[PDB]
Scaffold this active site. Structure first.
Site, mmCIF file in Angstrom:
data_model
loop_
_atom_site.group_PDB
_atom_site.id
_atom_site.type_symbol
_atom_site.label_atom_id
_atom_site.label_comp_id
_atom_site.label_asym_id
_atom_site.label_seq_id
_atom_site.Cartn_x
_atom_site.Cartn_y
_atom_site.Cartn_z
ATOM 1 N N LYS A 26 0.841 -1.193 0.000
ATOM 2 C CA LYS A 26 0.000 0.000 0.000
ATOM 3 C C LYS A 26 0.879 1.246 0.000
ATOM 4 O O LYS A 26 2.077 1.163 0.272
ATOM 5 C CB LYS A 26 -0.912 0.012 1.227
ATOM 6 C CG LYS A 26 -0.189 -0.034 2.573
ATOM 7 C CD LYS A 26 -1.031 -0.811 3.592
ATOM 8 C CE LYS A 26 -0.605 -0.555 5.042
ATOM 9 N NZ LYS A 26 -0.663 0.877 5.409
ATOM 10 N N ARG B 151 -9.489 0.088 15.328
ATOM 11 C CA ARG B 151 -9.607 0.719 14.013
ATOM 12 C C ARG B 151 -10.808 0.176 13.239
ATOM 13 O O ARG B 151 -11.876 0.792 13.214
ATOM 14 C CB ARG B 151 -8.311 0.478 13.230
ATOM 15 C CG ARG B 151 -8.147 1.307 11.968
ATOM 16 C CD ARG B 151 -6.707 1.243 11.462
ATOM 17 N NE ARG B 151 -6.254 -0.127 11.211
ATOM 18 C CZ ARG B 151 -5.059 -0.435 10.711
ATOM 19 N NH1 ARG B 151 -4.203 0.528 10.408
ATOM 20 N NH2 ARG B 151 -4.715 -1.703 10.519
ATOM 21 N N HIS C 213 -5.406 -7.448 13.562
ATOM 22 C CA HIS C 213 -4.149 -6.731 13.454
ATOM 23 C C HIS C 213 -3.699 -6.262 14.829
ATOM 24 O O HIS C 213 -4.527 -5.856 15.641
ATOM 25 C CB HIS C 213 -4.338 -5.537 12.524
ATOM 26 C CG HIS C 213 -3.078 -4.785 12.240
ATOM 27 N ND1 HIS C 213 -2.025 -5.333 11.544
ATOM 28 C CD2 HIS C 213 -2.712 -3.518 12.547
ATOM 29 C CE1 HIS C 213 -1.062 -4.438 11.435
ATOM 30 N NE2 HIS C 213 -1.452 -3.327 12.033
ATOM 31 N N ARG D 243 1.213 -10.871 6.823
ATOM 32 C CA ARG D 243 1.125 -9.668 6.002
ATOM 33 C C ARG D 243 2.400 -8.862 6.289
ATOM 34 O O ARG D 243 2.472 -8.086 7.247
ATOM 35 C CB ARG D 243 -0.149 -8.884 6.355
ATOM 36 C CG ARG D 243 -1.452 -9.690 6.184
ATOM 37 C CD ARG D 243 -2.730 -8.895 6.573
ATOM 38 N NE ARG D 243 -2.636 -8.216 7.872
ATOM 39 C CZ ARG D 243 -2.910 -8.778 9.051
ATOM 40 N NH1 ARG D 243 -3.298 -10.042 9.121
ATOM 41 N NH2 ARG D 243 -2.781 -8.076 10.167
ATOM 42 N N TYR E 153 14.760 32.465 4.148
ATOM 43 C CA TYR E 153 13.631 33.201 4.692
ATOM 44 C C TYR E 153 13.822 33.667 6.117
ATOM 45 O O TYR E 153 14.348 32.941 6.954
ATOM 46 C CB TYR E 153 12.363 32.354 4.575
ATOM 47 C CG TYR E 153 11.894 32.242 3.143
ATOM 48 C CD1 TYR E 153 11.706 33.390 2.368
ATOM 49 C CD2 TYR E 153 11.685 31.001 2.544
ATOM 50 C CE1 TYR E 153 11.327 33.309 1.035
ATOM 51 C CE2 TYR E 153 11.302 30.908 1.197
ATOM 52 C CZ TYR E 153 11.128 32.074 0.452
ATOM 53 O OH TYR E 153 10.773 32.023 -0.878
ATOM 54 N N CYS F 41 13.432 25.497 1.922
ATOM 55 C CA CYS F 41 12.439 26.032 0.994
ATOM 56 C C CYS F 41 11.616 24.925 0.334
ATOM 57 O O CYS F 41 11.898 23.741 0.510
ATOM 58 C CB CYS F 41 13.129 26.895 -0.073
ATOM 59 S SG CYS F 41 13.957 28.366 0.580
ATOM 60 N N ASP G 226 11.407 23.862 -2.782
ATOM 61 C CA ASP G 226 12.126 23.015 -3.734
ATOM 62 C C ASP G 226 13.642 23.047 -3.558
ATOM 63 O O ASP G 226 14.356 22.338 -4.266
ATOM 64 C CB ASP G 226 11.800 23.434 -5.179
ATOM 65 C CG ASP G 226 10.400 24.018 -5.327
ATOM 66 O OD1 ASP G 226 9.423 23.254 -5.203
ATOM 67 O OD2 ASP G 226 10.279 25.237 -5.573
HETATM 68 C C1 LIG Z 1 11.648 32.567 -7.012
HETATM 69 C C2 LIG Z 1 10.232 32.683 -6.522
HETATM 70 N N1 LIG Z 1 9.346 33.623 -7.063
HETATM 71 C C3 LIG Z 1 8.025 33.730 -6.598
HETATM 72 C C4 LIG Z 1 7.578 32.893 -5.577
HETATM 73 C C5 LIG Z 1 6.167 33.071 -5.121
HETATM 74 O O1 LIG Z 1 6.227 33.481 -3.771
HETATM 75 P P1 LIG Z 1 4.960 33.366 -2.917
HETATM 76 O O2 LIG Z 1 4.437 31.871 -2.913
HETATM 77 O O3 LIG Z 1 5.299 33.834 -1.437
HETATM 78 O O4 LIG Z 1 3.871 34.335 -3.559
HETATM 79 C C6 LIG Z 1 8.467 31.929 -5.006
HETATM 80 C C7 LIG Z 1 7.986 31.052 -3.932
HETATM 81 N N2 LIG Z 1 8.802 30.201 -3.368
HETATM 82 C C8 LIG Z 1 8.628 29.872 -2.006
HETATM 83 C C9 LIG Z 1 7.368 28.989 -1.802
HETATM 84 P P2 LIG Z 1 9.931 28.650 -1.607
HETATM 85 O O5 LIG Z 1 11.126 29.666 -1.631
HETATM 86 O O6 LIG Z 1 9.832 27.835 -0.318
HETATM 87 O O7 LIG Z 1 10.087 27.674 -2.825
HETATM 88 C C10 LIG Z 1 9.805 31.833 -5.484
HETATM 89 O O8 LIG Z 1 10.687 30.901 -4.951
HETATM 90 C C1 LIG Z 2 -3.876 -4.588 8.281
HETATM 91 C C2 LIG Z 2 -2.377 -4.594 8.129
HETATM 92 N N1 LIG Z 2 -1.667 -5.778 7.874
HETATM 93 C C3 LIG Z 2 -0.265 -5.774 7.740
HETATM 94 C C4 LIG Z 2 0.441 -4.574 7.860
HETATM 95 C C5 LIG Z 2 1.940 -4.636 7.719
HETATM 96 O O1 LIG Z 2 2.512 -4.166 8.944
HETATM 97 P P1 LIG Z 2 4.026 -3.812 8.991
HETATM 98 O O2 LIG Z 2 4.371 -2.675 7.936
HETATM 99 O O3 LIG Z 2 4.403 -3.282 10.442
HETATM 100 O O4 LIG Z 2 4.846 -5.137 8.678
HETATM 101 C C6 LIG Z 2 -0.267 -3.357 8.122
HETATM 102 C C7 LIG Z 2 0.490 -2.090 8.251
HETATM 103 N N2 LIG Z 2 -0.126 -0.929 8.534
HETATM 104 C C8 LIG Z 2 0.571 0.137 9.199
HETATM 105 C C9 LIG Z 2 1.616 0.770 8.251
HETATM 106 P P2 LIG Z 2 -0.580 1.539 9.399
HETATM 107 O O5 LIG Z 2 -1.588 0.914 10.392
HETATM 108 O O6 LIG Z 2 0.045 2.888 9.803
HETATM 109 O O7 LIG Z 2 -1.434 1.653 8.085
HETATM 110 C C10 LIG Z 2 -1.682 -3.377 8.255
HETATM 111 O O8 LIG Z 2 -2.377 -2.202 8.510
#
Ligand SMILES: Cc1ncc(COP(=O)(O)O)c(CN[C@@H](C)P(=O)(O)O)c1O
Ligand SMILES: Cc1ncc(COP(=O)(O)O)c(CN[C@@H](C)P(=O)(O)O)c1O
Lengths: 381, 380
Positions: free
Chosen positions: A38, A135, A165, A218, A264, A310, A312
């Site tokens: 999953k 659950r 589970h 599982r 920032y 940031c 990206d």
């Molecule tokens: C170069 C550049 N020009 C414009 C914007 C737009 O700014 P707003 O989302 O505050 O309107 C960004 C945004 N980037 C920040 C989310 P982050 O720096 O976390 O990627 C940017 O990087």
């Molecule tokens: C029904 C059921 N059967 C098996 C598994 C596998 O377990 P493991 O990843 O610990 O080996 C899960 C896992 N689920 C948890 C990630 P979460 O409960 O956060 O979805 C599950 O829900």
């Protein structure tokens, strides 16, 4: 597949193969293995991991909801798939035609299903019993017997399995785990007939008590080489092989003078002449703002993240002048240095499970098999 | 495009439209609006938001990296796109062929690209100048002139624009914003010929001082109806309309007795006989484990998330027994109650920017335009 940004994740399918083969060896021959894929195989790639697990000894798969099962069939998977969560009664025919098994825990669900379905494809059900996780699953005999009766009465409804589970199978102390198991044993008695598949164990329950698994386990977290809990690490039967690593490269390098600020809020200040590196990874890639006090690996050495992370991109203090293009490892090993998902999880104040799942669709996954690149998957390609 | 789990996000393109249109009225007919749609439009949907924005008054689009620009083109967007981050000199011909503009800040990048490209498509470059953000951009005169000389020298290289980015444009105190704005004006004097497009303002700077936005504005967060910061809210010229909401449904309901535990590690115990609801959303959906004690809306009332949040599911304490299928709102409004992205971010100890971005590919996006459902996007 191709990608045009120097940031990517790598999935070692050889590690996945080994983790599953080691389990096939561990479990009794009468116990089947159902690989849990999953959430896009916990961020590892659904079809890739499923393929490898099935060739390593798994015979069935499990997903969280119907769309995930349909996507697997789409990508060519033919093995049995069980949806572990809820589904719509109206979608019963779709799952049945697609040979997808469904979990059921309520009689009213079946009431609605029968009203909308009458053949020709059978729906295989797995009755979920709640023994302490709180659950999903039935909790009383009456509801349990009614569910069986509704299934038994419809010509196209089949009771393939029944399960529960565990909520604490990864804790050294087994008081609650023991309670649930015994609870499961008692509730099983409510069934008129035992289904072909009876299961309860996840990764932790499987690896610690392979003798208390009924006939299907599982397998999830451990398949990815991740410990169900670092606390039960010493109790694991065989060494786990981590299958996920994350990388990037320096796209800009500059030497700041004392007093210059970074990111920032001008939150960071170089108080001595120092080299700052910029990498193309940020919180929209799953490298959450919260990991700002953390570090990365550069030239086999650790370089702290500097300033605010940031969307990206983020900056790091280089140990000295390095060339643009130098590989950076966010998760993985560089020389004598290594950053594990458990390390990241600890700084994010979470569990390892959450970490790869958060590495967004934006980040390409490069698959390795037999130590060579097998394929590249770029979700936005 | 349909989906088969009862969890989905809703995006109001009318809000997107109004936020942009409202900025277009604030800015002069000469000023272009560059809609920042990186990160799948901050988790809102790149195509859908890009289309709407253009309809509302935007003339350009901006992304984080090449793949994001190429995905837009493939989806039909034929409008101008500028890559805000870095790229490979070897990919210059691909960007040129796709009419995708690239950000440049290193002369060595140009030397490499030049040796690898000779036409036929021209390639438009936007020179990034670092004036105090410390991320990307050129910082000295010699390098600035070397970059320009390399661009003017190449028959297929065109210096379409030049820009900088602010680090504190959302802070009431404008001293660092000032130093940066002034450093920009200084560094601009290093260029022989000024390029057509000169830009520097993001949501905050453009809504605050739209008179100092030069030729273009890069509109991001505010287009989505989200405030750049809590402290700038009372400085915003017009009310922003929040475009994102998130919902789910109850898929199981049951009554627990005191002493009964819920979820992993049994960190929660029912102190009294209570009704528990299970919803199909978890951290693999972007609903991080850290939201465990957060409240959702159900039946117009706040209900706390109880027990550890799972990968695909979580449990809540219901006001009473409710039918399976009852609508749960994680972000949005229900009756008198409303939960904003800002509320979620406050609980997660982060900024609103991060929240919609983390809502994953697993969650379908239902789009609304003209008060009607336009389309459903299910990434899987
Ligand atoms: C170069 C550049 N020009 C414009 C914007 C737009 O700014 P707003 O989302 O505050 O309107 C960004 C945004 N980037 C920040 C989310 P982050 O720096 O976390 O990627 C940017 O990087
Ligand atoms: C029904 C059921 N059967 C098996 C598994 C596998 O377990 P493991 O990843 O610990 O080996 C899960 C896992 N689920 C948890 C990630 P979460 O409960 O956060 O979805 C599950 O829900």
């Amino acid at each position: 597949n191709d990608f045009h940004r120097d940031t990517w994740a790598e999935v070692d399918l050889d590690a996945i193969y080994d983790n599953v083969e080691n389990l096939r060896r561990l479990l009794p021959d009468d116990t089947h293995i159902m690989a849990v894929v999953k959430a896009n195989a916990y961020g590892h790639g659904d079809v890739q991991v499923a393929r490898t697990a099935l060739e390593a000894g798994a015979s069935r798969l499990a997903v969280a909801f119907l769309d995930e099962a349909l996507a697997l069939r789409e990508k060519g998977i033919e093995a049995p798939i069980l949806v572990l969560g809820a589904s719509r009664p109206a979608d019963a025919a779709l799952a049945a035609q697609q040979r997808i098994a469904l979990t059921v825990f309520r009689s009213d669900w079946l009431e609605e299903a029968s009203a909308l379905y009458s053949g020709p494809f059978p729906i295989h059900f797995h009755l979920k019993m709640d023994t302490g996780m709180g659950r999903l699953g039935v909790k009383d005999e009456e509801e349990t017997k009614r569910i069986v009766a509704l299934i038994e009465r419809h010509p196209h409804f089949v009771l393939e399995g029944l399960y529960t589970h565990f909520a604490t199978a990864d804790e050294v102390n087994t008081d609650y785990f023991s309670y649930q198991y015994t609870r499961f044993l008692h509730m099983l008695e409510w069934l008129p007939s035992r289904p072909p598949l009876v299961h309860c164990a996840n990764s932790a329950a499987s690896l610690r008590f392979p003798d208390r698994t009924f006939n299907m386990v599982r397998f999830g977290i451990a398949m990815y080489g991740l410990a169900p809990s670092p606390g039960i690490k010493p109790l694991l039967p065989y060494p786990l092989k981590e299958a996920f690593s994350l990388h990037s490269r320096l796209v800009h390098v500059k030497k700041l003078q004392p007093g210059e600020k970074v990111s920032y809020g001008a939150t960071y200040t170089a108080q001595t002449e120092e080299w700052i590196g910029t990498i193309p990874i940020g919180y929209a890639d799953g490298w959450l703002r919260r990991l700002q006090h953390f570090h990365v690996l550069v030239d086999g050495q650790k370089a702290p993240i500097v300033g605010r992370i940031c969307m990206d991109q983020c900056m790091i203090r280089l140990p000295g002048p390095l060339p643009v293009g130098t590989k950076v490892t966010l998760i993985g090993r560089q020389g004598d240095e290594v950053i594990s998902i458990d390390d990241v999880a600890r700084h994010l104040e979470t569990i390892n499970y959450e970490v790869p799942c958060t590495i967004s669709y934006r980040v390409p996954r490069i698959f390795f098999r037999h130590k060579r690149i097998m394929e590249v998957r770029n979700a936005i390609g």
